[PDB]
Design a protein around this ligand. Sequence first.
Ligand SMILES: [Ca+2]
Ligand SMILES: [Cl-]
Length: 496
Amino acid sequence: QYSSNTQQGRTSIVHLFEWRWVDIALECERYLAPKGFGGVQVSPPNENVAIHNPFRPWWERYQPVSYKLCTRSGNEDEFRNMVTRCNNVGVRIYVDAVINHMCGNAVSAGTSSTCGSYFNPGSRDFPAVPYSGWDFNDGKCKTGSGDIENYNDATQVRDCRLSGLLDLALGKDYVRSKIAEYMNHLIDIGVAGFRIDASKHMWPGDIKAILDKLHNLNSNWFPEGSKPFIYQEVIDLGGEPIKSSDYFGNGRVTEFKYGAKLGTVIRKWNGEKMSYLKNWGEGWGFMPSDRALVFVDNHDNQRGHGAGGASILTFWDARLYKMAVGFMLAHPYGFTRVMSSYRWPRYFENGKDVNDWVGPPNDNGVTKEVTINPDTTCGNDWVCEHRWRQIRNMVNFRNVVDGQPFTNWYDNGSNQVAFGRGNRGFIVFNNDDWTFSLTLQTGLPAGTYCDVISGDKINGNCTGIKIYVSDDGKAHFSISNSAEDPFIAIHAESKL
Ligand SMILES: [Ca+2]
Ligand SMILES: [Cl-]
């Protein structure tokens, strides 16, 4: 479950949050494939609750009604069509598996579901699965409210309702099987792995028992013996009885310390400065690199939702955001996930975004397609951070330098740093209030290199800044403190 299963030479997965299957399918063939992306994390593909108050919030997709592959992103035909087309061009699909619970216990019974299935939360009735009262932890939970009341109690965090969400009895073989059934449906369709939603709220053993029932990946695209890639969502910033390491047996785990710390550093808050990033990684208290699923922000924290703090950088902070993502993509630590979002009508009430619930761009509830402007940007309020040249070129930078060791690090004691990856790449950052002008050892072979942040290499020339690495591997860098993108990057494939 530790192998990404991505095509030979691809190191990142992008989260196309709330995107529709047909758009992802197209996105794979026209952009993701030729741009070297490894895979796409898709929003939950199973039928969820249609919550009309508020109007179709993004979080309704985290409230299962059944395992029918029918959502606002598309039906089963479209889902299968997407997986096939993406796999045919070397781009993998990773499913966000919401298996810890069904919907909120207070949701009204009826057919307000993305596929019309009937369900009765009050009576614990989900016939489309089917699940009955016998399949939830109502009698196992020992709290007075029946919900999770204290995270200092590892047991209730696992057996009680997460904010009211009906907690599935993952200890029962029947439930474990119904879930395995759903996941094998996805695997057989072509899925390459899963993001396991709310991993902290399930015993590491129940998850395992579920994974033990899964098929090997589709043998038309994946080698024999291939197991689904597994990265469990566990928010652990320390201090809790539950640790991210408790899940290393099932696969990789989300490292929420990564984004929180990088953001505080890049924003230069709490006395942090980029020069401190020289021992970035385990040296900062993070989990082992071979188990970490890193990212700057995710669909949750870019909204402050159960977020890791205000330090989290997002597309709203474009300039600093690109530096954060660039550094992550260049640093060998962990497996990188790039975020891609939609712009919502953010409105504050003093540290309160009352519009953080707003779902994806839509027309009366129907998710809007992703239009592609000529400058390769996206319309209909889709941010598409993964298409920003600075991020897109850094995704390839990670591919190019893959396997090379972190070396040639330099820092000015403040916020001007630079480091390379073996003899295949070198990146430079200036986050100080003055100019960064210096000759640095890049560890790269002599030549003229295109800065892949400012431009691209095309027809034996650069469209942006050019860097000249002399015979001893040294090159001059000059990044103004007021540059729109205060960082430069070059690698073996950007060389003329
Ligand atoms: Ca649970
Ligand atoms: Cl996540």
